[PDB]
């Protein structure tokens, strides 16, 4: 088992959240990211579902993807990361002051869009894909999170798309769906800011967006934003999860762009 024994992960500084739980840079001499998950008396039928899910993470493998090192259960059920030391890209973005170059800002998104490749190969789809949960390591490699219990909406609904909002499914998202989800972290890259900075209502937003009369702001881009980039990531943003690009496609643009400039 691939459980770690109790004892050996100690946890410290919150981050904060953190899906189905809490984030902490915790230790086990060697930083590591805990995720303290929300479950208090574990029933050994959800215990075996986190197992399931846990043996997931142990074949999902990539470089742009957060390393699954190791879960517990006693005392509580925690999912074991590496540790990013550059924080998110959230963090970099809306929350501090950092010259970010044109130059890393498209590797910053093509990394990203491999990271979200090989998870679609691996029929996974995120449902949660922000730039709260893309990680930029010290090595300056961007890492993704906040995919794992898949099998198992609170509360960002920026990078939600129009389909997702409204919703009419039960299981609204899609391979498409992460795609829009990616077209705002495409915009977040470019402008710098998160879209919809003029209004400020939060039900106004999902009724606007879901109707279709709302949508991110193109035109705050930065002037040294290639076309190129600029018409893709419009693509992404389309209303019907019919006509958004796929992954590959969207790989395959972003780093034949960089090699242009
Ligand atoms: C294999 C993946 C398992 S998962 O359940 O699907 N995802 C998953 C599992 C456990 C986690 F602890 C996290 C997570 O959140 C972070 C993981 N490494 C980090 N490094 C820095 C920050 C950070 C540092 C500083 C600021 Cl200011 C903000 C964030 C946040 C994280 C996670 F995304």
Redesign the pocket.
Same mark, same amino acid.
């Given at each position: 088992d691939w459980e770690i024994p109790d004892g050996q992960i100690t946890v410290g500084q919150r981050? %904060?959240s %953190?899906? *189905? %739980?809490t984030?902490?840079?915790?230790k086990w001499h060697g930083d $590591?990211? $805990?995720?303290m998950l929300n479950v208090t008396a574990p029933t050994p039928q959800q215990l075996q579902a986190f197992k399931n899910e846990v043996g997931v =993470?142990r074949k /999902?493998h990539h470089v742009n993807? =957060?390393? *699954?090192?190791g879960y517990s259960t006693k005392p509580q059920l925690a999912? $074991? /990361?590496?540790?990013?030391?550059?924080?998110?890209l959230?963090?970099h973005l809306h929350?501090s002051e950092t010259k970010f170059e044109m130059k890393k800002l498209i590797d910053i998104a093509r990394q990203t869009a491999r990271g979200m490749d090989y998870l679609h190969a691996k029929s996974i789809i995120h449902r949660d894909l922000k730039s709260?949960?893309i990680? =930029?390591?010290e090595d300056n490699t961007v890492?993704?999170?906040? *995919? %794992? =219990?898949a099998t198992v909406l609170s509360g960002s609904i920026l990078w939600m798309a129009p389909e997702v909002i409204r919703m009419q499914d039960s299981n609204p998202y899609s391979f498409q769906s992460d795609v829009y989800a990616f077209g705002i972290v495409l915009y977040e890259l470019m402008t710098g800011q998160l879209p919809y900075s003029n209004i400020n209502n939060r039900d106004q937003i999902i009724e606007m967006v879901g109707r279709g009369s709302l949508s991110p702001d193109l035109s705050k881009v930065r002037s040294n934003c290639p076309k190129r980039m600029k018409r893709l990531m419009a693509e992404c943003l389309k209303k019907k999860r019919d006509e958004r690009p796929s992954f590959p496609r969207i790989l395959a643009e972003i780093e034949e762009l960089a090699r242009e400039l």
């Open positions: 981050i %904060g %953190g899906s *189905f %739980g984030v902490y840079k915790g $590591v990211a $805990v995720k =993470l /999902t993807i =957060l390393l *699954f090192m999912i $074991v /990361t590496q540790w990013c030391e550059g924080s998110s959230y963090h929350a709260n949960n990680f =930029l390591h890492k993704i999170g906040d *995919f %794992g =219990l």
